[PDB]
Scaffold this active site. Structure first.
Site, PDB file in Angstrom:
ATOM      1  N   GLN B 110       0.811  -1.214   0.000  1.00 21.09           N
ATOM      2  CA  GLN B 110       0.000   0.000   0.000  1.00 21.09           C
ATOM      3  C   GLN B 110       0.846   1.267   0.000  1.00 21.09           C
ATOM      4  OE1 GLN B 110      -3.305  -0.396  -0.313  1.00 21.09           O
ATOM      5  NE2 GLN B 110      -3.187   1.742  -0.976  1.00 21.09           N
ATOM      6  N   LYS B 125      -2.775  -1.088   5.890  1.00 23.72           N
ATOM      7  CA  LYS B 125      -3.884  -1.964   5.587  1.00 23.72           C
ATOM      8  C   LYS B 125      -4.571  -2.412   6.876  1.00 23.72           C
ATOM      9  CE  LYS B 125      -5.763  -3.593   1.711  1.00 23.72           C
ATOM     10  NZ  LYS B 125      -5.813  -3.045   0.314  1.00 23.72           N
ATOM     11  N   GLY B 164     -12.338   1.013   1.526  1.00 16.01           N
ATOM     12  CA  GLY B 164     -12.897  -0.274   1.151  1.00 16.01           C
ATOM     13  C   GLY B 164     -11.870  -1.266   0.648  1.00 16.01           C
ATOM     14  N   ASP B 165     -12.222  -2.539   0.759  1.00 16.08           N
ATOM     15  CA  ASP B 165     -11.461  -3.605   0.121  1.00 16.08           C
ATOM     16  C   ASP B 165     -12.326  -4.855   0.053  1.00 16.08           C
ATOM     17  OD1 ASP B 165      -8.421  -3.134  -0.513  1.00 16.08           O
ATOM     18  OD2 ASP B 165      -8.622  -5.330  -0.195  1.00 16.08           O
ATOM     19  N   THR B 209     -10.888   3.529 -11.464  1.00 14.89           N
ATOM     20  CA  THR B 209      -9.870   2.589 -11.924  1.00 14.89           C
ATOM     21  C   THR B 209      -9.902   2.451 -13.446  1.00 14.89           C
ATOM     22  OG1 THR B 209      -9.818   1.351  -9.843  1.00 14.89           O
ATOM     23  CG2 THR B 209      -8.982   0.262 -11.801  1.00 14.89           C
TER      24      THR B 209
END
Lengths: 448, 447, 447, 444
Positions: B110, B125, B164-165, B209
């Site tokens: 990250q 994270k 978010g993930d 994205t």
């Protein structure tokens, strides 16, 4: 359901019976939202309406202080933080002896929606004190402010609660309260309040805001239907803050503003206002007992004692004076003479019966709640000190205000188009105001 | 670097029980050998040895009640890996798999990706071993609320902004932000990104994205005199990345002739159109909604279980999953004359297939840089919440664009500086590491 | 006092819709006329006009979730009334009838019971319109959590320290404390009182009121010749107050002859023994065993459907409910020549009974001051918690004894004084008020 | 002038006798505010001045540290938070053995007016330590800096007080300090500081800032008078930071800069500077005479550049480097404007003659405030939270300098001084602060 809506209105009228001013405001607000509550079975599943009617947080506090003779008085202080779903709590402070919880709660409940209305991230709250600024000395108000703020600071902040002016609170009070704020907290944090002076800045365009924005909003209503202010006959009532700047902007879009009224009579200017004219008009409405009757005679114009402008043949009608200033038999004359658009500068000038009429048949109609709002928007623009930047040169603030008004229109229409209508801007504006809070409150879960 | 080699070894021995972390360390450090080489000062201040240990790790118990009133117990995690260039940042993950090792490898990475974007985000994270699988909307609320009751004290708009993930979407955010705003008593909406629009979420978030992938490849293209106009494009996957790559691709003039699910590829050869793509979005928008359904509805080819690399195209945009583009597809595209391939999904091309994509001199954009419009825009979200304004969709998009072209220009071409030729993979990776090495050095030996 | 009359009048007007509070400022303020006349300084700094407005009042929303999933919302209150002689102290009431008027009247009086104790405790009252009735073990929990999730930011061991009342017991306080600990991340177990032993509760708490009653009446009884030694005692009720009044009276060689519940009085001519109490305590804590079974089991006398007031005794301690010793019953006592009456329960003596009781000249210890056992030993709890250890019962019991005694003394002492000879009402009122007035005088404006 | 000012100045001369530097500053500041204080009887009513001259808050603290040999030294740190009405406290830190409270208070006091003078919302403050960085290793500055910030962190912050660099303190120490700040407070909150490296929040145009603004300002001055840098011959003294970029910006406005100098002497290139000539010089270790040879350009030892006829004069070297005789030649030769990159390069006698022409004069107080303006810009960026292209920062710096000019010229104008930049620069600095202290009441 308006079954749902009606039942909440019921419990409130019972439960808060001894808070009248707030009960009407709940009623007057939740009864406009029937259809929307209808579309959303889920709201009542999570008890949305019930939660919305109880403030998030309410603060009352003792406020001891000393007059210029060293007599110690004591008033009550209030800050009702009603809703913070879509921003930090925002709302003005009111120093007036009538001030109570009920009043602060109703003002606060309303502030929520007018704040959402703007599209800027602002919460809903009100606050104040029974402190009566009447015949108080500067020092006395300064000291009252200091004490008031000595307790209030712990519950507010640039990211928590940003208060402002109102009845009995102006840039003078705001600056004293700030003075005290930074003395206590220990840093700058000028965002903790709006309404400030330009020196600890303090936004430009703020006095302009409300009137500039009425014109901006109606230019958009005019846009959707291939019209504009450009060479159109505009009639304006009032001659205070809104009107002065209604006229100003109105005449940059190249309209011909032909009227201005006060409590006594109306001025009529065939050729329409110009810069020099208007400026002088202000000088007289800042020299009580300077009357609009004088402006007329000084400039050689027809004046109309006991009469409102509404008997005038105009394309656009802009009432910015008082409540209920535009009645059923004023809209009868206005429509007959070919009125294209009518927009609210003051606070609820058009009566309910004259809003029907304008609305069907013809006539656009901008609701003040959305149409005035410029002032409420530019308070949000003051925040934008978070930017820590040299205000904006006023052009930069006007541009933004212009775009913002456009968006409150755009999304106010879209709101109706959405729920089975079309250019009822009245139901704008109600919905959207409520939609934004609603959605935020749904998203944030069952906490607040 | 004998130095780099040595750190890698030390980490192997010390974190053996942490395979994914150990792996992601070697995988990343091994690439910085030329950089470390040119910076003999790094070893002096034990730089690498510091960078691989996260500044701070928080683990916490997460008791909650399900709908039956039964008590469960999960574990929360937030690994604030590196805060040198911005406030810790990176997403939250709810999955049963989740542990320190996974939390740490995603976190370490990250750091580099956030740095890559050229916005002041750090690297972190987080998540829980909670399993969103068949939990009620409400169950997920109570869990998010229990999660945030501990986490709020460690994070903040200036401190650590999660997101978010896997396992965590705007639904989970939102529930979390709500518990957070209730505890601290402020707005501070900059604490989280990926919010809904009503309390400060950004426009362009959904499209980030995808769009960004088009913006990036365009930058890769235009530096080799080419561009999207009139070019044949193929897209794998049919999710949000694939969806907006196509939307941007054709906004640029391109002609897009594919899409896909794990069921099969669909070919159109007149190219998608705004109207055409709009329906795919709807179909693929649940449930059972399949690509073939989109193909049938428009009488277009549907390759039953194949993938779009067969078709000759000028440009290939894989947006499906890991490894979805191996040596098989690689020769085909080279044969048929592919000019450029660019990753919208997570490392979708195999290492072997990145080949020797060297041959034909095929232009190649690593996901690391190319699929990073999401994370770049979370910065843009962070910035808007800071301005307490909302930017128009146009504004956000114009700046996602300018960003992406920068992720390219300086993150690929230095590279270059260290003489690796035109190697976006290694040359944008060094760029990430460098900004963090720069700042860490400047800030002395504290963290 | 005209000033006290002007304040009273002003208050009736401004808070007309808040009856309870108007009535209570009336009751309380109209008994300090003398004190105020001896102190012109108070009016110069508006002491009364300040004392009647609480320093800080908090209302908040409390959304909570049913055992079967539906959302309820209640309102939460905390009235911080006076904090001049210590941290806001005062319990929390959970009851559907709760409002600001009630929270205000209770707060105002709590400032004074509190001051009265000589411990450094200010005054406040709080709670919710939440109604625990018909609510499950686990619904109260979820509610307490939602309640504290806001309240914590306004309280704490050094700021405001709540306790129990109607609807708030050791159960509700534990849930609230639990949530507090989780939110603020420390122990701070001094934030509430009424706690369980395991996390800082206090020994002697259950006994506080009834032990305190005995201690108080003794001091009262000595400044007037006698004491519990060999005297005949009538106690009403089977509660913690009742039981432990009997307990402590027995340690003073007293002959306690009654005890009652809603179904009648027990008469024991030979007096309670240490064994006899133990076995009554066992019963009356075991629904549904009652006073009667205690009698039938010891061959004692049982008067069904009546109170111990027709029972000839030296000393009557009413320990059941409010207005339980009335007009026509006040006569029997007097007829049978009762020397002294002291109220352990809450306002059990009707404003008539207190005709007055002298008239007759019979010693009278008003509950205000006499049942302050619990309020005092709650201060002891705060105390032990601050010390970071637990005192033995002997030690708390001891401290409670000197405190109660100090309560009598000051209540008679500076309480004459002032004129009215031996009036324990009024006295209790003047000493309460006095301490606050002095402390508030000392720290200026504002508060 | 006024008696209210003379009184206070007197009061201060008495109380801070041992604080010579402070006292000099106060009398040097308040002396020039006569007309303003006269036109505002409300100040004295509520005791402005008497307040303004006492710093809102003063912090001093022990700074123990260890050198590369294990020896414990101990220095003293200072942060004077002088004024905070218009923004959070703002000003640099100094590391020098001369440092004391008298210096801190003087520098701090001026700092508050230089900041106000800037239009940005920045307050006033100076800070530092008697620590002496000479002959100290990198690691010794780092450990000192940390010791310094371990105490200081609690008194500052993005919203509270935002230090920066000064003599003894550059990006290197600003980084070491910020390093410790974030290790301790445990968030990012860059913007606690300025003069940072671009990697964790720094701004572009920072190196350029002073010198650019110098050019932007005077070019504003010139427009007001219907002129511009374009076409004109321009002379510069000194050859460092301010010197260099003054030439770059000037060159970009189409001006022929024909001089450059240093503690030694001057170069004369009447053909003018070029992007590339200005490239070589810069030299480090090695002086100006060299760049004259390397280009076959006429060099003159010992003497300043002021004897050359020019259209504009840009002193960027030292203090009092423009004496009278010089100012006389300048005027004689046609000089149309002069402006101060350096600190007070002109003496009041030489300033006097100039304003007694003929000659447009830009006081260094306004004209060299580029770096102070762009440091407020850096705070703005950090708030935003993004970087701005070098071109963006510049555009904004360009506008801010013009504002500084307009505001200055407007203030002298209000008070009937009719285009004296020197006086306006002193007034708007005081005016804004005064307006805000007046509105905020009696609290500070």
């Amino acid at each position: 359901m308006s079954k749902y809506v009606d039942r909440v209105i019921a419990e409130v009228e019972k439960k808060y019976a001894d808070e009248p001013e707030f009960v009407q405001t709940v009623e007057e607000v939740l009864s406009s939202l029937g259809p929307v509550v209808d579309a959303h079975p889920e709201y009542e599943e999570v008890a949305l309406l019930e939660r919305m009617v109880i403030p998030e947080r309410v603060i009352e506090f003792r406020v001891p202080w000393e007059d210029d003779n060293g007599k110690v008085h004591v008033n009550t202080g209030y800050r009702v933080q009603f809703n913070g779903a879509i921003g930090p709590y925002k709302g003005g402070l009111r120093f007036a002896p009538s001030v109570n919880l009920s009043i602060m709660k109703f003002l606060g409940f309303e502030q929520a929606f007018k704040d959402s209305l703007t599209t800027l991230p602002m919460g809903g709250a009100k606050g104040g004190s029974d402190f009566d600024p009447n015949g108080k000395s500067d020092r006395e108000v300064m000291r009252f402010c200091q004490a008031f703020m000595t307790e209030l600071y712990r519950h507010i902040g640039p990211d928590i609660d940003v208060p402002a002016g109102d009845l009995g609170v102006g840039a003078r009070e705001i600056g004293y309260m700030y003075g005290q704020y930074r003395k206590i907290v220990g840093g700058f944090y000028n965002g903790v309040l709006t309404g400030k002076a330009r020196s600890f800045g303090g936004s430009l365009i703020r006095p302009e805001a409300t009137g500039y924005g009425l014109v901006y909003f109606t230019e958009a209503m005019l846009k959707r239907h291939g019209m504009g202010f450009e060479g159109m006959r505009v009639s304006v009532s009032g001659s205070g803050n809104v009107a002065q700047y209604a006229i100003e902007k109105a005449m940059e879009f190249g309209a011909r503003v032909i009227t201005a009224s006060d409590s006594s009579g109306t001025v009529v200017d065939e050729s329409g206002f110009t810069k020099e004219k208007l400026a002088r008009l202000i000088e007289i409405k800042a020299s009580r007992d300077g009357r609009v009757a004088d402006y007329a005679k000084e400039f050689g114009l027809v004046y109309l004692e006991g009469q409102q402008p509404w008997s005038l043949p105009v394309d656009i009608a802009l009432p910015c004076a008082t409540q209920n200033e535009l009645d059923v038999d004023a809209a009868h004359q206005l429509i007959a003479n070919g009125v294209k658009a009518v927009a609210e500068g003051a606070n609820m000038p058009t009566t309910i019966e004259a809003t029907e009429l304008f609305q069907q048949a013809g006539v656009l109609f901008a609701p003040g709640k959305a149409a005035n709002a410029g002032g409420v928007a530019t308070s949000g623009l003051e925040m934008a000190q978070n930017a820590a930047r040299l205000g904006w040169k006023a052009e930069k603030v006007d541009a933004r205000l212009h775009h913002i008004m456009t968006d409150i229109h755009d999304g106010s229409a879209a709101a109706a188009e959405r729920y089975g209508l079309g250019y009822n801007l009245v139901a704008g504006a109600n919905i959207v105001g409520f939609q934004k809070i609603a959605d935020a409150m749904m998203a944030q879960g069952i906490a607040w």
